Amino acid sequence: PMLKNVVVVGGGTAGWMTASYLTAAFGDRIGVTLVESKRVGSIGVGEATFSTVRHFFEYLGLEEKEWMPACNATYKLAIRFENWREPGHHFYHPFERQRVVDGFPLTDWWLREPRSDRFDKDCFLVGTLCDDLKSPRQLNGELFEGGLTTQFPYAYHFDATLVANYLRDYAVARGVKHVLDDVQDVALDDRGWISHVVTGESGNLTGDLFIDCTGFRSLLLGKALAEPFQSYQDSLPNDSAVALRVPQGLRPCTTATAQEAGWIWTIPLFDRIGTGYVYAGDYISPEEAERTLRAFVGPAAEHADANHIKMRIGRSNRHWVNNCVAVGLSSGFVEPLESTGIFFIQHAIEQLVKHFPDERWDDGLRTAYNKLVNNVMDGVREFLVVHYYAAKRQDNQYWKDAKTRPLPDGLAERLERWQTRLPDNESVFPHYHGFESYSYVCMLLGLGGLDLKSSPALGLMDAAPARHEFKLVGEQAAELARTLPTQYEYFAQLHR
Template sequence: MTKPITKITIVGGGTAGWLSALYLITFLDYKAGPDKPKCNITLIESSDIPTVGVGEATIQNVRETFKSLDLDETEWMTRCNATFKIAIKFVNWLGKNDVFWHPFNELPEVNGLDLSHYVVDKKLNNPDFDLQSYHKEVPICLAQKSPKLGTEDDYKGKLDYGYHLDAGLLATYLREKAISRGVNHIVDKVQDVNLTEQGFIKSLKTENHGDIEGELFIDCSGFRGLLINQALGEPFTSYADSLFCDRAIAIALPTDDEKDGINPYTTATTLSAGWSWHTPLYGRSGNGYVYSSQFLEPEQAETEFRNFLGEKASNVPARHLKMRIGKNRNAWVKNCVSIGLSTGFIEPLESTGIYLIEMGIQTLISCFPDQTFNPIFRNQYNRRITKFYEEIRDFIVLHYCLSQREDTPFWKANKNNSAIPESLQEKLEYFQVMSPNLDGFETHLLFEDYSYFCILSGKEYLPKNSLPILKYLDVKEADKTLENIIIDAQKMQSILPKHYDYLKELHQGKLENFRLLFGQKSRKPSALVTK
């Protein structure tokens, strides 16, 4: 009879550490039956090591994760100054003051074919056709509308949505929840790692609490990789040949939400050696410059970024961050699993940082070992995590490799870069012939056909010819579908509240005002619906 894991030790706090701790305590203890084995979870973090916390935007998947953890949406959103996110707006990626969008959505089918094929056909036959017109979210974003009426249950809205949030406040909130459910919290420094003769981690030597033992260790120590890299020597695989950005500058700015409103989208605007993010929170905005140190020194980057932000940023302090782009060869080694930045990092262009934490811990639950640490679980975990990272890497490279810009050395280098992953190169050859259909590609876990089409159409990388089968089909139904998208957007604009108004009522505990307005006097029990 094998012995179950009864002691888990997590090193590092932040979003990765505390989300891992909360997830583990919830599913191994909080929601487990009374006759199940008891699992003690300890998290060790140092008060001297700040969290990175620059990623303040999420994708829509986090709603299901937070729902499964029994987190009240109103409570955590108000605690973390969160706002809703319906899309990403990309500005000047062609170098023409252009704009394109990547909303949370999918396109309907017409005659058994994805609508994107008809959109391509329209563009090829009419160069003036607006490729952004099939996004019903765009006019709603521009009108600064909320994706929720206020009458819905938690994690349910009229549109699919993610969030913008304060990462530091989120870590604090998750910590409180995890401790309340039984996680043991130790504030101390890990000075050394004690290994067994077989190379497994036996215990952690701390400055003030002696040796802390465990059976399974979770490394959430960030870019340091204290356990996985430093103690166990797992090599790191860099993505620097295809992703040049390795530095970031972060500046938080106050906002006048009542006057200016709150955008329900993230903005990614290109600069000379990378791109700038703008994430609107309740009461402030998160702003950053992700750039390549090959092309700019930190002082040059900060000067450019402050000029971009304008006078409002002149006296605001900036944080400079170094980023380790890539991933460990293996995320699970011996009895140690790395999650978050200690596993790897890909620039936050598509807001995937928290998602990778979620996938790390959820995949661990599905591959959870006993004390024999059967390598089958470890190998399955490592294969899946590698696929997640490689798929996201390819999708981010897609934003750069199609660049035709030569206005700065950085953009010229991206245009001429030949180090495109083979897995992406295969897709690009396919996309020259027909719109994305990823069913035949092995790496397909997060980004759907629609996401690829958003970027490809925004970068003006379309098939050279219409899909041959369209010659045999009546396109009137596709025209009607496009018209219905516009009509649907107009209807939603007319009923959805302003984003700021919704959040103001949320913070003041007055969402009942919206419920009364729309004829629903009380909230029904929560149920997750993605749209």
């Protein structure tokens, strides 16, 4: 007794990732309909991704060389953090797993005896590749790792509208019914379950399962079903953004430049730059934020229209209620400091397939699904609070307040453990939330606000293997700088 029809409401990145993934997972064995407005646009942002996104394209059977040119896409090997510790300081948060020497990470050996003033230069390859604007692939397509299960779980930058167009064509070609219309009413039955959605001129769209991809407005879950929403704003005050699209070497990383009341993203696409100021409206006005952003970008922004966005920061109490699942901004959101919006969508849809119901609608599937999503969002929220707490700067009220806001449960205890020994698998938020322990280590070392200590055991061990590893990183960096093409060179002859 299996379900027969899914209705997806919304045609942004969330809706078309949902629809395309459903056809990849279930084929023609279930019907999928997507309805989307002709007049309400998508949010217009969401252009950097997280490590897991490679597996989304793999699941659909899409190779980089076919979708990347069609989506204005580049590689994201890291995030470059600027001015978080102090003025003029920068460091990389790379998609690069730790090197472990005799049971201890190289970063631990570094902390014992720093080889330079840059932990990321000494311990990692990827930051240097970003500085040299390198492609992660040689001109013959082979990944650089093969010349040294991957140590480099990288991601992408792309135009979210082009990706959504690409997945729409992917999904419609595989039988997804596409309705271009407004949902004007969500009809509930006597159980409070969704019976159908009423469209302006396409009749009623009926189905067994309804996916709310309507964005922040959450027309099905938050509005029609009145599901409570849990704000994160007390712990993360950034509630606003102003975004620009700007004409444009391609640095394979996102840049996050701390500002007086937030931070500015720089996302390099193949032929343009996406940039925006994420800020706290209680500290600066939208006018000041736009002024700051335009001055930061410089003359290239003098003719670009600013896109002002109010963010709904938090998560729904439940994400799957009755026969309705929220995917995308309707489900939850944190500021894009670590590029988690599309990660949340992929997690939501992957776990919806894994917990997909039959006609018995086992409530335990909902309970498990909701716990998984809540744990992912709570964990990312904790990770982001650490960004502001561990940022060394306390130069104004905003950056002082970043250390006195209420911490999520358990973070105070974890902060104390991290100042005893660097974070590892057993000293971070103990549920899946995307980020691995190496991300915590890098952020703490770069942000520089905590009192970090190396493990005393290192003093009783042979330092030779660690010294060899540091030397090896330098040799491999030198070889990669000589051989890898620049990212522009790579895409220039790939766009042939």
